[PDB]
């Protein structure tokens, strides 16, 4: 895990959390 | 499979009488049978020949393009198709710490033949020069190119094909270019790199016959 792929993984996790938050309103 | 070269006749290709050497070499074609007439295979053929093989006491870094037009019998009478330069001098004249000037024109001769002349010019380093840059300003390059265009426009509009290809055998066009651009900036290697034709008029038998003497 270098910084760029960690950033990509964090972005994917943020997308999944945003999607579950907007579907769990 | 039958031998395919049992039906091949060695023809003769002839240079026009404006050159010294008339005999260029020999080509071949299949005999006439039905849809393949033997004169058609020599209708469009371009010969990349050298200048020292064309003349005697001349240089060997220039090439000419000769195209056949018609055959009378066992003879392939040729005509001017273009002028090129050998690639060796083309990548040997270019050097670092010097600039280039190139001009291209769409001029038409006094007959129905239209030419396209390309030119290249380089940089002369003086004998007492210590500087290794030998560059030039942009407006000097524009003025040298303008001299090139007016020289190439002036010298061929009053002449026909025979006179311009007679002038192409020496470097008199290049000499006039390098003599016109003397008070602007010196040039050391001026040559006509390429000659191309765009417009081909209706073929005339008498003009080609008088072109061969």
């Amino acid at each position: 895990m270098r910084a760029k792929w960690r950033k990509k993984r964090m972005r994917r996790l943020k997308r999944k959390r945003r999607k579950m938050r907007q579907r769990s309103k | 499979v039958v031998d395919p070269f049992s039906k091949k006749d060695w023809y003769d290709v002839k240079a026009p009488a404006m050159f010294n050497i008339r005999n260029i070499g020999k080509t071949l074609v299949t005999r006439t049978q039905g849809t393949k007439i033997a004169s058609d295979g020599l209708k469009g053929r371009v010969f990349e020949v050298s200048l020292a093989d064309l003349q005697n006491d001349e240089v060997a870094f220039r090439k000419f393009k000769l195209i056949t037009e018609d055959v009378q019998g066992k003879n392939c009478l040729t005509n001017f198709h273009g002028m090129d330069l050998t690639r060796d001098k083309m990548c040997s004249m270019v050097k670092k710490w010097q600039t280039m000037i190139e001009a291209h024109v769409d001029v038409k001769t006094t007959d129905g033949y239209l030419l396209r002349l390309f030119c290249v010019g380089f940089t002369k380093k003086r004998n007492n020069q210590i500087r290794k840059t030998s560059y030039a300003q942009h407006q000097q390059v524009r003025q040298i190119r303008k001299k090139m265009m007016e020289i190439m426009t002036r010298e061929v509009q009053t002449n026909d094909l025979k006179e311009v290809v007679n002038k192409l055998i020496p470097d008199s066009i290049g000499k006039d270019i390098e003599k016109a651009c003397q008070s602007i900036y010196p040039l050391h290697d001026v040559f006509v790199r390429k000659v191309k034709m765009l417009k081909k008029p209706k073929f005339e038998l008498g003009k080609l016959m008088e072109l061969h003497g």
Binding site: - | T86, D88, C91, S92
Partner: protein, 101 residues
């Protein structure tokens, strides 16, 4: 740390130059960074010149030359042993390598 006075290239006030391609590789390298080599070659090599001049019809026939320009990525240049690593004190030598023959 800072290895060189420059950054291994030859831009001082530009910020961007057009990219070129390597010869052995297909790597996109900037033009002023790549190690150029304008090699001067001819057709025949050392001993075929006698056979060519014996078979050439024209007497005193001058032989042509081949002029190409070669652009190298630095990894493909070092792997081809055209440039070698130097010491820290002798790195600051911009003089070209000496030619003899």
């Amino acid at each position: 740390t800072k290895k060189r006075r420059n950054n291994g290239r030859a831009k001082k006030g530009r910020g961007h130059v057009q990219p070129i391609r390597c010869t052995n590789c297909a790597c996109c390298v900037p033009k002023d960074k790549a190690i150029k080599k304008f090699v001067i070659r001819n057709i025949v090599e050392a001993a075929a010149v006698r056979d060519i001049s014996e078979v050439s019809v024209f007497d005193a026939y001058v032989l042509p030359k081949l002029y190409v320009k070669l652009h190298y990525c630095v990894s493909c240049a070092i792997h081809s042993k055209v440039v070698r690593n130097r010491s820290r004190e002798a790195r600051k030598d911009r003089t070209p390598p000496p030619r003899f023959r």
